[PDB]
Amino acid sequence: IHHHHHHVINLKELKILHTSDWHLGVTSWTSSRPVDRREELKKALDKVVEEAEKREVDLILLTGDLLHSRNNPSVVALHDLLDYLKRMMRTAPVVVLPGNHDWKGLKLFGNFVTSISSDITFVMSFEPVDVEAKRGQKVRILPFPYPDESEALRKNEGDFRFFLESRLNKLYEEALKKEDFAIFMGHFTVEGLAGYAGIEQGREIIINRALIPSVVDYAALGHIHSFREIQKQPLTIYPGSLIRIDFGEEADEKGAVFVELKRGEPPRYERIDASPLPLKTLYYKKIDTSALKSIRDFCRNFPGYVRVVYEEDSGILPDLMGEIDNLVKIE
Amino acid sequence: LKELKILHTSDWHLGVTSWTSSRPVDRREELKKALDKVVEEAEKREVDLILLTGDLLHSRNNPSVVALHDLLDYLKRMMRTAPVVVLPGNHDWKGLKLFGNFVTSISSDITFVMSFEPVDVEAKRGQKVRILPFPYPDESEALRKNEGDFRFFLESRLNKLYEEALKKEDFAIFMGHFTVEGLAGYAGIEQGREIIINRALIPSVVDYAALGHIHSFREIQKQPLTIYPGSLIRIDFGEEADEKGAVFVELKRGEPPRYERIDASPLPLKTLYYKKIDTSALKSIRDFCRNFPGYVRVVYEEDSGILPDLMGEIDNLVKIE
Ligand SMILES: N=C1NC(=O)/C(=C\c2ccc(N)cc2)S1
Ligand SMILES: N=C1NC(=O)/C(=C\c2ccc(N)cc2)S1
Ligand SMILES: [Mn+2]
Ligand SMILES: [Mn+2]
Ligand SMILES: [Mn+2]
Ligand SMILES: [Mn+2]
Known about the structure:
Two copies of one chain form a homodimer.
Chain A: E1 13-20, E2 27-28, E3 35-36, H1 38-55, E4 59-63, H2 75-91, E5 94-96, H3 105-116, E6 120-122, E7 129-132, E8 138-144, H4 157-176, E9 181-187, E10 189-190, E11 206-207, E12 218-222, E13 228-232, E14 235-238, E15 255-262, E16 268-273, E17 279-284, H5 289-301, E18 305-310, H6 320-323, E19 327-329
Parallel strand pairs in A: 1-4, 4-5, 5-6, 8-9, 9-12, 10-11, 12-14, 17-18, 18-19
Antiparallel strand pairs in A: 1-15, 2-3, 7-8, 13-14, 15-16
Helix pairs in contact in A: 1-2
The structure holds the ligand N=C1NC(=O)/C(=C\c2ccc(N)cc2)S1 (2 copies) and manganese (II) ion (4 copies).
GO biological process, one term (chain B): DNA replication
GO molecular function, one term (chain B): 3'-5' exonuclease activity
Organism (chain B): Thermotoga maritima (strain ATCC 43589 / DSM 3109 / JCM 10099 / NBRC 100826 / MSB8)
């Protein structure tokens, strides 16, 4: 059959897959016990792709840091990225808002790929773009990337805040010129976060959630690893990362977000859980005989990675990382 | 179909700055005009297929953003006119292979042949074309120390291409990035030690052999028709006498192939020769350069003591030997 977009008359519905912060290419705990997260990460990504196809989404939104390396991504990481970008494009048109990009190679690539394809669009400026979704829906994207060049010469703080607000105001005005659906995409830290939300840094863009153009149908955000429903009007969501990158993301819930829009009804969304490996931190004053019993017992059938935190040395520690392949950090 | 119109251009060398050690000249503006003229002629003649060989980028390992932008820009312009097939030259940056594969898979208007693996493509009017690619082999220095089996390796690849060229529908096109043996006279790369291939070892069954890496136009042979289209600008004074441009190949099933040379009309180069630089020499040099719309080289034999800062007063003069 055909492989192009459908064109349904008077269609006022839009199914959206939104995921972010893949951190392709990451290796965790390099200073204690390096663990390549690739296999786990690819599993999570596969599950997201499968849910996208199953739910037959109309549009796929990618925000946040899809790569882990800010300047020097490995070939494997790049290959994995382009591979999954391609897998998603087969499902539905993809819109990519890159995060903190350092190397200039991305901008040329993004522009060229956008110019030759109708199933992927890279938004790398504050300029709104109109895109066509899987079933012919017209969608206006209001992009808000990490400011470049001006962010280096951002001083003073006062004028930088006014620059940001001005960009948001312009985005608001252009959102009023929407044909059908309008979606905001941003890569920054919402003011007043409380969790993780911790790291950073980095040089971060802080933006009040009330400044996000209220007249958009959805506000797709990235940069933070934890899933957060920022607000409901307009619906604003950080999907979070797909794996637990470090132990500050122990209590986090990881995955993507499925969003459905109807022009008469309020927006609804379901979480798509990636079910990544769990993390656990064990706390002790000293690693005594009781603590050894506790540590060995817990790690025994624990399916994820474990960190042990203690206060004081009290003799030669047994080779715990030797007998426990699960243990990745004793500080 | 049973016909096939081809635009074959090569060796753009985007990003090149000529005569760096002497008087550096950014060839971008000139090169773009030449590129613009080639694109216009591909639109006029309404070609079915565009073949790109040779070194489209001048820098081997570290191309500038401006050069990359210009490359992608012109690839895009080519794609609007006809499906594009790119055989990369001596690639060095591993990102190129992934980029090329990705772009090839997401677009039916461009194909990057990164390996020796044959690829079937469709021209502007449905013409099924089998591409037999022969790129600069990576790890070429790994088996180069032997020389013996290195030749045997290259021959094996050519044999496979020959065998694979046999099972083809409609048209079959060879694309290679190497130096044909016996080529005397530019001969300007590396050099260095490139890959040397005997022209008779080019699969005789193909309908056309698109070659790159050579700056000067060369009709290597007629059966099969083998052509280096050459560069679009005169890179250095060795190419002073060259006519620069691309090649319009018109293939017809049954009838013998034909081709026309598409002049790009880049800036002229001139070398002035003197026995020595005397007061009479300076006058003629200044007068010629003032009226010459291109770049000038001056070579002289005898030491003429001290001569005025010609390259400081003559913007046209780019090299003195
Ligand atoms: N399409 C992409 N978007 C990004 O943000 C990417 C990578 C990236 C890598 C490291 C960072 N610190 C931020 C972003 S790749
Ligand atoms: N599309 C392209 N094909 C090439 O061969 C390109 C560049 C290139 C640069 C330096 C070389 N030594 C060989 C090829 S770019
Ligand atoms: Mn970020
Ligand atoms: Mn992040
Ligand atoms: Mn070359
Ligand atoms: Mn060359």
